[PDB]
Amino acid sequence: ALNEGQIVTLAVDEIIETISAITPMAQKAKKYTPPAASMQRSSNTIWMPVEQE
């Protein structure tokens, strides 16, 4: 009784809700997005800057 679009929509919605609820610690840590956007090369060894002194 489920068509393909509803399958995709319900699956994505449930994944998002469940991951965002039962993960309190991952939400407290800072989120970083690297501009590299590599493709299936284990990404890269992304070298992240640290605050200057």
Add this chain to the structure above:
Amino acid sequence: SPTQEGWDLTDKATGLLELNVAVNMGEPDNDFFQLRADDLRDETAYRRRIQSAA
């Protein structure tokens, strides 16, 4: 000033000491650094760099 008591105070305002303290501002405190492309790519990274400087 010393205690000034009585109706007549002749030549008692004069002679009081006025003392000063000196401050030397000197030279400014600088934070001289380079702004790179990753700092200027968006507002948040630039704010992070400027926050680190300040």
